[PDB]
Curated annotation (Swiss-Prot):
Major site of localization recorded for this protein: secreted
Species: Pseudomonas aeruginosa
Protein name: Extended-spectrum beta-lactamase PER-1
Effect of A142S: Similar catalytic efficiency to wild-type with respect to benzyl penicillin, cephalosporins and aztreonam
Miscellaneous comment text of the record: The class A beta-lactamase family has a specific amino-acid numbering system, sometimes called Ambler or ABL numbering and often misspelt as Amber. A multiple sequence alignment was used to derive a consensus sequence and then the consensus was numbered taking into account insertions and deletions. This allows use of identical numbers, e.g. for active site residues, despite differences in protein length. UniProt always uses natural numbering of residues, hence there appear to be differences in numbering between this entry and some papers.
């Protein structure tokens, strides 16, 4: 739809950032893409793809949700966002895969993320999995530790807005995971504690939203990435897929999140307009 595209452009024009958007409503044949040729750093958004690969290996019986990993407090990535390190006491403890997944997805935990990467063969294994789903415009080459070591690396874990739309559609179609794995991932994405003022920012109270955020620190005067992508359930229970990636922004943190909230609200209102007519 040209009208929705124009409404979204009216939000991003004038903001000192480059914004990518993908909107796919339930009656749309193709998704609406804003800035389709730009490469967007994913930051923690790729923990979504990683959870799908891990659950896919659980579905195949290659991994078990209760399989546990020994965590040595001295050997994991130090001084990074890792809530799991505060959930257990001791210099050494063991955590099941089920909980590492929950912490990576819902809490965007960086240590849980890298521990999961180690069970499946690293970034290379995730990249193969993504390509195997037919998504060519998403690249994964580094884990959190490597992204932590060199701040240019984050740009190498990128996605196009078509790639963001496809991962949401694959997930939404419930064709990649067993019913159990699908229900677990939906649970962790609805329970996310991060980014409450992004996609969910201006939606009505009670709207169900399964989403995953991605954020970088302010370095060299800009925020490389402020992202949120997810599934919004409409009043009739049908899904609305929305992904918003704000790249290389020189705006305040508050403004970066408001761009995402406004785009989500505009897409949501547009779907109500269609339900209103049809």
């Amino acid at each position: 739809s040209p009208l929705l595209k124009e409404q979204i452009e009216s939000i991003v024009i004038g903001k000192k950032a480059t914004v990518g958007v993908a909107v796919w409503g339930p009656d749309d044949l193709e998704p609406l893409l804003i800035n389709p040729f730009e490469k967007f750093p994913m930051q923690s958004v790729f923990k979504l793809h990683l959870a799908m690969l891990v659950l896919h290996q659980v579905d195949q019986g290659k991994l078990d949700l209760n399989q546990t990993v020994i965590v040595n407090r001295a050997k994991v990535l130090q001084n990074t966002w890792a809530p799991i390190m505060k959930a257990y006491q001791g210099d050494e403890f063991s955590v099941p895969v089920q909980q590492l997944l929950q912490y990576s997805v819902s809490h965007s935990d960086n240590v849980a993320c890298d521990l999961l990467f180690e069970l499946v063969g690293g970034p290379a294994a995730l990249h193969d999995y993504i390509q195997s789903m037919g998504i060519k415009e998403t690249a994964v080459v580094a884990n959190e530790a490597q992204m932590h070591a060199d701040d240019q690396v984050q740009y190498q874990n990128w996605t196009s807005m078509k790639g963001a739309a496809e991962i949401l559609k694959k997930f939404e179609q419930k064709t990649q995971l067993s019913e159990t794995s699908q229900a677990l991932l939906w649970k962790w994405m609805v329970e996310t504690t991060t980014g409450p003022e992004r996609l969910k920012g201006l939606l009505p109270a009670g709207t169900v939203v399964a989403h995953k955020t991605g954020t970088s620190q302010i370095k060299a005067g800009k925020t490389a990435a402020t992202n949120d992508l997810g599934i919004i359930l409409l009043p009739d229970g049908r899904p609305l897929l929305v992904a918003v990636f704000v790249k290389d922004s020189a705006e305040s943190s508050r403004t970066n999140e408001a761009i995402i909230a406004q785009v989500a609200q505009t897409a949501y209102q547009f779907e109500l307009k269609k339900l209103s007519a049809l």
